[PDB]
Write an enzyme that holds these catalytic residues in place. Structure first.
Site, PDB file in Angstrom:
ATOM      1  N   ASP A   1     -23.631  51.485  41.043  1.00  0.00           N
ATOM      2  CA  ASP A   1     -22.295  50.902  41.238  1.00  0.00           C
ATOM      3  C   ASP A   1     -21.212  52.019  41.324  1.00  0.00           C
ATOM      4  O   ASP A   1     -20.022  51.732  41.260  1.00  0.00           O
ATOM      5  CB  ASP A   1     -22.023  49.862  40.108  1.00  0.00           C
ATOM      6  CG  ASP A   1     -20.841  48.905  40.264  1.00  0.00           C
ATOM      7  OD1 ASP A   1     -20.375  48.711  41.412  1.00  0.00           O
ATOM      8  OD2 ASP A   1     -20.365  48.366  39.225  1.00  0.00           O
TER       9      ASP A   1
ATOM     10  N   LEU B   1      -6.633  45.876  29.621  1.00  0.00           N
ATOM     11  CA  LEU B   1      -6.610  46.927  30.636  1.00  0.00           C
ATOM     12  C   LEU B   1      -7.808  46.739  31.608  1.00  0.00           C
ATOM     13  O   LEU B   1      -7.985  47.500  32.570  1.00  0.00           O
ATOM     14  CB  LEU B   1      -6.466  48.358  30.065  1.00  0.00           C
ATOM     15  CG  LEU B   1      -7.545  48.917  29.151  1.00  0.00           C
ATOM     16  CD1 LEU B   1      -8.719  49.411  29.934  1.00  0.00           C
ATOM     17  CD2 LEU B   1      -7.009  50.067  28.359  1.00  0.00           C
ATOM     18  N   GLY B   2      -8.566  45.668  31.355  1.00  0.00           N
ATOM     19  CA  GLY B   2      -9.725  45.255  32.133  1.00  0.00           C
ATOM     20  C   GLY B   2      -9.994  43.761  32.124  1.00  0.00           C
ATOM     21  O   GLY B   2      -9.351  43.002  31.384  1.00  0.00           O
ATOM     22  N   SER B   3     -10.952  43.337  32.978  1.00  0.00           N
ATOM     23  CA  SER B   3     -11.410  41.955  33.173  1.00  0.00           C
ATOM     24  C   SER B   3     -12.793  41.958  33.840  1.00  0.00           C
ATOM     25  O   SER B   3     -13.223  42.983  34.380  1.00  0.00           O
ATOM     26  CB  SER B   3     -10.429  41.175  34.052  1.00  0.00           C
ATOM     27  OG  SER B   3      -9.187  40.936  33.409  1.00  0.00           O
ATOM     28  N   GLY B   4     -13.460  40.804  33.806  1.00  0.00           N
ATOM     29  CA  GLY B   4     -14.767  40.615  34.425  1.00  0.00           C
ATOM     30  C   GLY B   4     -15.519  39.377  33.983  1.00  0.00           C
ATOM     31  O   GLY B   4     -15.047  38.614  33.129  1.00  0.00           O
ATOM     32  N   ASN B   5     -16.721  39.191  34.568  1.00  0.00           N
ATOM     33  CA  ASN B   5     -17.657  38.101  34.259  1.00  0.00           C
ATOM     34  C   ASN B   5     -18.065  38.182  32.778  1.00  0.00           C
ATOM     35  O   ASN B   5     -18.303  37.149  32.137  1.00  0.00           O
ATOM     36  CB  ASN B   5     -18.899  38.189  35.157  1.00  0.00           C
TER      37      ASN B   5
ATOM     38  N   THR C   1     -13.021  40.418  28.696  1.00  0.00           N
ATOM     39  CA  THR C   1     -11.828  41.263  28.812  1.00  0.00           C
ATOM     40  C   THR C   1     -12.031  42.608  28.145  1.00  0.00           C
ATOM     41  O   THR C   1     -12.760  42.710  27.154  1.00  0.00           O
ATOM     42  CB  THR C   1     -10.603  40.556  28.211  1.00  0.00           C
ATOM     43  OG1 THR C   1     -10.781  40.428  26.799  1.00  0.00           O
ATOM     44  CG2 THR C   1     -10.351  39.190  28.828  1.00  0.00           C
TER      45      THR C   1
HETATM   46  C1  LIG Z   1      -3.356  50.865  34.512  1.00  0.00           C
HETATM   47  C2  LIG Z   1      -4.712  50.560  34.026  1.00  0.00           C
HETATM   48  N1  LIG Z   1      -5.380  49.489  34.472  1.00  0.00           N
HETATM   49  N2  LIG Z   1      -6.547  49.562  33.806  1.00  0.00           N
HETATM   50  C3  LIG Z   1      -6.665  50.645  32.978  1.00  0.00           C
HETATM   51  C4  LIG Z   1      -7.705  51.073  32.181  1.00  0.00           C
HETATM   52  C5  LIG Z   1      -7.483  52.241  31.472  1.00  0.00           C
HETATM   53  N3  LIG Z   1      -8.431  52.833  30.621  1.00  0.00           N
HETATM   54  C6  LIG Z   1      -9.799  52.536  30.499  1.00  0.00           C
HETATM   55  N4  LIG Z   1     -10.228  51.334  30.893  1.00  0.00           N
HETATM   56  C7  LIG Z   1     -11.503  50.948  30.752  1.00  0.00           C
HETATM   57  N5  LIG Z   1     -11.909  49.677  31.191  1.00  0.00           N
HETATM   58  C8  LIG Z   1     -11.015  49.040  32.177  1.00  0.00           C
HETATM   59  C9  LIG Z   1     -11.517  48.243  33.344  1.00  0.00           C
HETATM   60  C10 LIG Z   1     -10.839  49.558  33.578  1.00  0.00           C
HETATM   61  C11 LIG Z   1     -12.340  51.888  30.189  1.00  0.00           C
HETATM   62  O1  LIG Z   1     -13.677  51.811  29.943  1.00  0.00           O
HETATM   63  C12 LIG Z   1     -14.062  53.001  29.401  1.00  0.00           C
HETATM   64  C13 LIG Z   1     -12.987  53.848  29.294  1.00  0.00           C
HETATM   65  C14 LIG Z   1     -11.876  53.129  29.806  1.00  0.00           C
HETATM   66  N6  LIG Z   1     -10.579  53.471  29.938  1.00  0.00           N
HETATM   67  C15 LIG Z   1      -6.272  52.896  31.556  1.00  0.00           C
HETATM   68  C16 LIG Z   1      -5.238  52.473  32.362  1.00  0.00           C
HETATM   69  C17 LIG Z   1      -5.464  51.314  33.090  1.00  0.00           C
END
Ligand SMILES: Cc1n[nH]c2cc(Nc3nc(NC4CC4)c4occc4n3)ccc12
Ligand SMILES: Cc1n[nH]c2cc(Nc3nc(NC4CC4)c4occc4n3)ccc12
Lengths: 266, 264
Positions: free
Chosen positions: A127, A15-19, A22
């Site tokens: 940020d 649900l995430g990415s970066g340097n 994941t």
């Molecule tokens: C649709 C969709 N894309 N990304 C999402 C990320 C989340 N929830 C989330 N994501 C984190 N890190 C991710 C880089 C954002 C978090 O870090 C701390 C809390 C937290 N909650 C939910 C939905 C999506």
């Protein structure tokens, strides 16, 4: 705060990415139930940076700030945080345009609350943006990404330094000083982004172009259908002079006082 | 669709009850044999309310869905269905703790197939729970109680509104938007109950306590002895965001593959 890998359960999808690496979805076998967790996984300084973010987090305890659950040393490094079920505010407001103005004020007012705590606790976000504001529900926001964030000294009012120049105040650009007033500038740019619905600030302009614009006393306009009293506040956030720019205490007050009317007198 | 009461024989002991009326066991003079039937007997609008249930049923032909034999306008209104010889999954599993893990998977996979049919046909069950799954055999389950079920328009993805909160998804509680995705949330609540051996979900908690627990990112724990992968699947059903939640095709595909391996 050194979590047990047996309790943690990851979703084999990010649900995430970066340097850093994941961010995968997870489930941590908590006290009696199961807490859904967001988990920053290291793919050096990347371990020092993640221990910095883990320290900035462990200190902060506020509803409107992403609570940390703990560190987890296993096959890789795991920073376990309280999952924001709906995701980043810019990507969310792009997709859902039916989000009424009132819902938007409530959300930015929740950021102004969390930021007011960060101010009182002597922390610089550095940020603060639409990207770094994540949603628990459609009416519950949490401030995330504490990688640039800095704990201030007791006798110190500011920090002195990668380059989110569109969210940065003139003193951050010119003299590298960052304080809670610099986050009030970012908050201005963040407030803009929301009422725009995730539209990117100063569209197409380069870093110096933004600097040159602000020195000319020029600002971004009122996004379409934004309540005048919110654009009023954006420009107040956007005061060139740091001493005359409001603090989060005065900003959150202006958001609280407006919202209190909006729900009742509307 | 219109059964001769000359062919219908009703017992004395009931299989259930409600505001609708009683569910007496019966026998129906059929083809050359006799079919065992479950019969819903009205005790106003309830007539067109039970006609709604008979209509949802008339349209649905799938092995894992309680088939309707027809209606009967005699003493009182009768809705004649195909008998689920063993009864509700919760009561069956409460009263049978010897039932093995391989057995429960097979039954929830059967619920998942009937649900994949319902999703594909653009129907929203709206009351999916262990209690609304009936057992024909300890190895053959059926989705029943199509009372709350709605039949979506060809252009609508969801329906907008008795209220079994502990089975409802957050989008339902908050905004009253039921869809096959909301039935996945309920399916996850069904999947929990079945491995809990008929234990009631979120025991002691009020509706708002449940709602608050969900928004806090908390979900019910792993019932004792429940295959980890089946607990991994409940959490998938229990996805707050409807868009990111699996559909029934996705849910069946995970149970089918697991069971495919588990038996072989
Ligand atoms: C649709 C969709 N894309 N990304 C999402 C990320 C989340 N929830 C989330 N994501 C984190 N890190 C991710 C880089 C954002 C978090 O870090 C701390 C809390 C937290 N909650 C939910 C939905 C999506
Ligand atoms: C031991 C026991 N208790 N109840 C039972 C119900 C059944 N079979 C059954 N029951 C229905 N409705 C009942 C209220 C649930 C049905 O509705 C449509 C079909 C159908 N088949 C069998 C055993 C028991």
């Amino acid at each position: 705060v050194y979590l047990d890998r047996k309790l943690l359960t990851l979703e084999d999808k990010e649900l995430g990415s970066g340097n850093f690496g994941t961010v995968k979805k997870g489930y941590y076998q908590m006290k009696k139930v199961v807490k859904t967790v967001a988990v920053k996984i290291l793919k050096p300084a990347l371990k020092d940076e993640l221990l910095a973010e883990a320290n900035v987090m462990q200190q902060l305890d506020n509803p409107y700030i992403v609570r940390m659950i703990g560190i987890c040393e296993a096959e890789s490094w795991m920073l376990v945080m309280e999952m924001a079920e709906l995701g980043p505010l810019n990507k969310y407001l792009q997709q859902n345009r039916h989000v009424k103005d009132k819902n938007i004020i409530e959300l930015v007012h929740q950021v102004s609350m969390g930021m007011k705590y960060l101010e009182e606790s002597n922390f610089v976000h550095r940020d603060l943006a639409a990207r770094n504001v994540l949603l628990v529900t459609q009416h519950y926001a949490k401030i995330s990404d504490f990688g640039l964030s800095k704990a201030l000294r007791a006798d110190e009012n500011y920090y002195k330094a990668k380059w989110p120049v569109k969210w940065y105040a003139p003193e951050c650009i010119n003299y590298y000083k960052f304080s809670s007033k610099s986050d009030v500038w970012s908050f201005g740019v963040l407030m803009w982004e929301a009422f725009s619905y995730g539209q990117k600030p100063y569209r197409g302009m380069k870093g110096s172009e933004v600097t040159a614009m602000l020195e000319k006393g020029e600002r971004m306009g009122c996004p379409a259908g934004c309540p005048r009293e919110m654009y009023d506040l954006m420009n107040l956030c956007w005061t060139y002079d740091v001493e005359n720019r409001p603090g989060f205490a005065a900003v959150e007050l202006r958001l609280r006082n407006y919202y209190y009317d909006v729900v009742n007198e509307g």
